[PDB]
Write a protein that binds this ligand. Structure first.
Ligand code: HEM
Ligand SMILES: CC1(C)[C@H]2CC(=O)[C@]1(C)C[C@H]2O
Length: 408
């Protein structure tokens, strides 16, 4: 049963589209394919859906890029749909606008900057190799449960100095954040609230122990960056450490599944990566253009007209980032991975002050994964007649990716 809200007076009927971000029409064919259905040659740049409490959707890459870059007009005070969930959302610095945002991003950058991430390469590689060698000789694996849900999680827990046995409970919380249970805005609001509270509960004792700590882990490093000459306050720290976990454990996991499904169906592309190691390294950004995973929102600051559309203060706009990288107006043949594409511009990591803090880590993890995968399993395919199961939400998800190959 579908829950609809009535459009407000300022929303004209010709802009209304029945789009359910948590259950996209056509989702069985793929998350990216389902979002692409929304982006027809003449659809308005901004459309409004009565689902998920009622909100706008930006349908073209230029709007998505622009909105991310304009925090003074499009605020981060709410970045989730439905509104109830977005209002319950308590993660730092992602809930913040400049200038409050900036010192917390600085703190994060102390741990996640490119020079720090480069130091992590060999530890990431070791984890990759270890997992891959578990099944490489076997000639088949279920890629989701045997690799994509394992690799980025072990990497991040190691980096964060946390026990790997916590993976399960943290993945469960993460999934209730990005796809909160419920068929109703109020239900989803509650689901998100309980998950966000679970993160705070888990993270509180760690914060208390690592304040002033001498650990070399990511949490200790970031926790102990001063904020305006003072220790980071408790409320902020809870939201900050929870966000680290949320970003580290869900994002790359999901991305890898979508990426691998495409690769398993395009051996010519795989062969190119295998024969030119530099095309692989240089081609990773094209993969990020092609396999966006995040669809989140911004809050309209003031009554305004934007791309010919009347917007009211408090309106939410969902930003399906796939609709930038896959916008046929930004990239010719957007659905094809072209490792040589010169222009790969995309919003897979968003734009503006919130542009992904973990993007260097995400690129390194993917780069190392492909290098170590192709070294040991150079050719592979999706099992015959296999059907991946897809989910849409704030972060896309996919499971059931049975791969097959001939042991080398
Ligand atoms: C496939 C991988 C990833 C994708 C597609 C991705 C996507 C994004 C997006 C779209 C945002 C902006 C959200 C918004 O403000 O509306 C973001 C922010 C952020 N991400 Fe990532 N992310 C990925 C990996 C990671 C990883 C591995 C981490 C490690 C902790 C991470 C940490 C963060 C943090 C801390 C922010 C907030 C930055 C700020 O508010 O200034 N992300 N990410
Ligand atoms: C949308 C995000 C991917 C981004 C902000 C969130 O809450 C995430 C789910 C984790 C972080 O990286």
């Amino acid at each position: 049963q579908k829950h609809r809200v009535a459009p407000p007076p300022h929303v004209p009927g010709h802009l209304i589209r029945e789009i359910d971000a948590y259950d996209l029409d056509g989702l069985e064919q793929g998350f990216h394919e389902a979002w692409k259905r929304v982006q027809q040659p003449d659809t308005p740049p901004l459309v409004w859906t009565p689902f998920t409490g009622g909100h706008w959707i930006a349908t073209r890459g230029t709007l998505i890029d622009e909105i991310y870059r304009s925090p003074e007009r499009f605020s981060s005070r709410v970045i989730w749909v439905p509104r109830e969930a977005g209002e319950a959302y308590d993660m730092v610095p992602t809930k913040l606008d400049p200038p409050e945002h900036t010192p917390y991003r600085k703190a994060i950058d102390k741990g996640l900057n490119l020079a720090e991430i480069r130091k992590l390469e060999d530890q990431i590689r070791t984890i990759a190799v270890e997992i891959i060698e578990g099944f490489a000789d076997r000639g088949h694996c279920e890629f989701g449960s045997e690799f994509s849900t394992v690799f980025p999680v072990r990497v991040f827990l190691a980096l964060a100095g946390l026990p790997v046995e916590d993976a399960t409970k943290l993945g469960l919380l993460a999934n209730e954040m990005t796809r909160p249970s419920g068929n109703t805005p109020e239900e989803q609001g509650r689901s998100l609230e309980a998950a966000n509270k679970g993160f705070f509960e888990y993270v509180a004792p760690i914060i208390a122990a690592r304040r002033g700590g001498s650990g070399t882990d990511l949490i200790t490093r970031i926790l102990n960056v001063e904020i305006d000459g003072k220790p980071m306050p408790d409320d902020r720290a809870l939201g900050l450490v929870s966000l680290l976990l949320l970003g580290g454990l869900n994002t790359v996991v999901n991305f890898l599944g979508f990426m691998m499904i495409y690769l398993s169906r395009h051996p010519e592309t795989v062969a190119e990566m295998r024969r030119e190691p530099l095309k692989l390294q240089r081609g990773v950004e094209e993969l990020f253009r092609r396999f966006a995973v995040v669809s989140d929102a911004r809050y309209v600051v003031s009554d305004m007209e934007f791309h010919g559309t009347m917007l009211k203060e408090g309106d939410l706009i969902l930003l399906p980032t796939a609709l930038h990288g896959l916008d046929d107006r930004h990239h010719d043949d957007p659905m094809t991975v072209d490792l040589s594409r010169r222009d790969v511009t995309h919003s897979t990591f968003a734009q503006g002050p919130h542009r992904c803090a973990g993007m260097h880590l995400a690129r390194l993890e993917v780069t190392v994964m492909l290098q170590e995968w192709l070294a040991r399993i150079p050719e592979f395919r999706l099992k015959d007649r296999a059907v991946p199961i897809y989910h849409s939400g704030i972060v896309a998800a996919v499971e059931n990716i049975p791969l097959e190959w001939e042991p080398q």
